[PDB]
Homo-oligomer: A and B are copies of this chain.
Amino acid sequence: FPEVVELNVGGQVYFTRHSTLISIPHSLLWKMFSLAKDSKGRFFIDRDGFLFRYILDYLRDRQVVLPDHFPEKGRLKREAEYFQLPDLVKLLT
């Protein structure tokens, strides 16, 4: 795996360090990068691309600040459940 991982999450392109994916043990992204690829060779994640932005920031800071009047807290909580990030699930409840 390269140091800088190029991801396609349901159509949205994200770039992150390999270490970041590794950061939470026993999470889904940790299990994934201890693979499906798009036409451009990027690693594919079949999830909502817009909400991944906040999943990625939680992996970076082990905490996430949301935009003011964020209407998708519930949807983000479901994404957190899928990515097996229980502490993030707890923060959203």
**Total copies of the chain:** 15
With A60-B47, A61-B78, A80-B4 in contact, do A19 and B15 touch (Cβ < 8 Å)? Answer: no
On whether the beta carbons of A84 and B39 are closer than 8 Å, the reply is: no
Secondary structure call for the A interface: mixed
Q: Which residues of B contact A28 (CB under 8 A)?
A: 3, 26
Q: Which residues of A contact B (CB under 8 A)?
A: 2-4, 6-8, 10-17, 19-20, 22-23, 25-26, 28, 30-32, 36-39, 44, 46-50, 53, 56-57, 60-63, 65-75, 77-78, 80-82, 84-87, 89-90, 93
20 A-B residue pairings within 8 Å (CB atoms):
A3-B37, A3-B44, A4-B37, A4-B44, A4-B89, A6-B38, A7-B11, A8-B15, A11-B12, A15-B49, A15-B86, A15-B89, A16-B46, A17-B25, A17-B26, A19-B19, A19-B22, A19-B26, A25-B36, A47-B60
